[PDB]
Symmetry: C5
Subunit: 103 residues, 5 copies
Amino acid sequence: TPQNITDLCAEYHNTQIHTLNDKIFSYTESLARKREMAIITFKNGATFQVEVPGSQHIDSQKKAIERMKDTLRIAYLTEAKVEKLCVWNNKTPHAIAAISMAN
Amino acid sequence: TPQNITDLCAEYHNTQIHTLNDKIFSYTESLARKREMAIITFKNGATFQVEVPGSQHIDSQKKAIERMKDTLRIAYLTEAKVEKLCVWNNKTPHAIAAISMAN
Amino acid sequence: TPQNITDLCAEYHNTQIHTLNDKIFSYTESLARKREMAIITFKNGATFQVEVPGSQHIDSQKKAIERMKDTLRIAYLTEAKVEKLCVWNNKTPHAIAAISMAN
Amino acid sequence: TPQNITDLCAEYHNTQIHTLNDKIFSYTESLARKREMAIITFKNGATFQVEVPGSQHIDSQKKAIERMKDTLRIAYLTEAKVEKLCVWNNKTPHAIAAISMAN
Amino acid sequence: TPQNITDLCAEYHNTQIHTLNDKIFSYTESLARKREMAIITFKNGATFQVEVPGSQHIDSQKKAIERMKDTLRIAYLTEAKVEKLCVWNNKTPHAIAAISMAN
Ligand SMILES: CC(=O)N[C@H]1[C@H](O[C@@H]2[C@H](O[C@]3(C(=O)O)C[C@H](O)[C@@H](NC(C)=O)[C@H]([C@H](O)[C@H](O)CO)O3)[C@@H](O)[C@H](O[C@H]3[C@H](O)[C@@H](O)[C@H](O)O[C@@H]3CO)O[C@@H]2CO)O[C@H](CO)[C@H](O)[C@@H]1O[C@@H]1O[C@H](CO)[C@H](O)[C@H](O)[C@H]1O
Ligand SMILES: CC(=O)N[C@H]1[C@H](O[C@@H]2[C@H](O[C@]3(C(=O)O)C[C@H](O)[C@@H](NC(C)=O)[C@H]([C@H](O)[C@H](O)CO)O3)[C@@H](O)[C@H](O[C@H]3[C@H](O)[C@@H](O)[C@H](O)O[C@@H]3CO)O[C@@H]2CO)O[C@H](CO)[C@H](O)[C@@H]1O[C@@H]1O[C@H](CO)[C@H](O)[C@H](O)[C@H]1O
Ligand SMILES: [Cl-]
């Protein structure tokens, strides 16, 4: 089993690690139909998304999706420093697959 | 897929962006029959609501609505500054569709 | 659709507004059978309850009962000032229908 | 309907009030099979548990049990002062039936 | 029945206690398929995981698994001190079974 975000990220196709070492700059949440998702940017301008759940996700992923949204929300509110992001780069904005936070 | 709230709002009918750049002034919550909802106001008098889930709403929108309510409560509690709100102006108060918070 | 708590409270039978403008003094919670409920009081001795969900309530009522409880707990914990409460006066202690918070 | 924890506790068999007026000393949580439970202690050594959900518990019970766990966790983390506990004294450690918190 | 994490940990095969008395150093969360899990680290390098639900778990443990993730998440964000962890040492990284926190 992967021991860290890096090795975990390397297990899938079209992924890439982004090292931020910075807190989240803005948080956006949408309840609009077909656009039920969350978006975040950082000071440098990088923008990321938590994908609207769809056909490319199995049941275990749907719940993990809801948890990831809870997570970003509280991290943003408490101004926590996000270290790294493992994202799928074949989408725009890049879709978040994993996150790590280190004080 | 939109990169921001403005473009996202631009994807629906009867929507509209509101720049507040201010923390929520009042938060109201009701559990009364058929009026299970939340209402927020800003110091300028601006008043918005999170629509009572309805027949039209599907499961995805339903839990999105639940999350928004959670979002408004904690944001109000943390005095988090809200930047913009994308609302459906064909209702009174205007219903919230999306929200953005900055730093 | 109503825009504030006083106007909302006025749409039902046997309700009333209690103006508090003060934080909750104590929070009580129970998991005992038939009394799975929460109770709060204010320094002035005022006491209120969130009804135990019954047969009368539909699931949308039920979910709202759940949220109110969450709301009260976190309100108590953050020491937020509660402004007004819309309550059913046909019960004892008076049962909560809606709540508003503002500073 | 009871208005305080003492009166509510008095409605059952084999219960008892414990007055603590102190914050939680430690919090323990387990996911191990048949031990999916929470245990809390106070500085004076006192120890209490939230029973593992079982067959006797109706939806309202199990759900109330899940809530009690969220409550104790957050009470612990925020260092909230626990006033009294209503517990079943025919179980070791004594099992929590209700809780009250005051400043 | 068991009063502490040590005794509880003792009821299973392949377990072991780790006394840490320190705060979580990094927190990692993933929503990738078959990797819907969490991983934590402590300053000395020690790594632990919450296992992806599997056939070795029942619905009761599945709930508890979601709860443990929420727990690790707030503990981290709040820099709470974890005292001990009961883990399964037949896996890599070590799988968390129970956790104790004390100021
Ligand atoms: C790259 C891709 O299209 N992935 C989609 C996936 O397709 C399957 C194979 O991809 C992997 C992968 O993503 O790397 C292979 C991994 O080892 C799998 N790992 C595990 C632990 O299961 C994952 C995993 O199944 C998915 O990520 C879960 O959603 O899938 C893909 O390579 C394969 O297609 C080959 C084909 O076999 C070969 O003959 C041909 O020559 O080349 C193809 C491309 O390499 O086909 C597999 C399906 O039959 O399928 C899932 C849905 O079932 C998704 O569509 C996944 O796409 C990504 O989904 C992400 C969410 O999980 C996210 O939205 C990304 O943005 C999507 O591209
Ligand atoms: C050690 C093990 O194999 N555990 C798996 C379990 O197997 C059962 C027996 O082990 C216990 C244990 O873990 O100590 C026995 C406990 O008394 C049980 N306690 C309670 C309250 O129920 C637990 C419990 O069932 C599991 O932890 C739940 O997942 O299981 C194991 O000894 C046994 O096989 C014996 C056999 O009976 C004996 O004749 C033979 O000669 O020696 C064998 C090995 O000592 O069989 C039991 C199952 O038939 O079964 C469950 C599935 O039901 C899991 O697969 C469990 O594996 C662990 O699961 C953990 C998560 O809960 C975690 O992932 C660990 O990493 C897994 O190893
Ligand atoms: Cl009884």
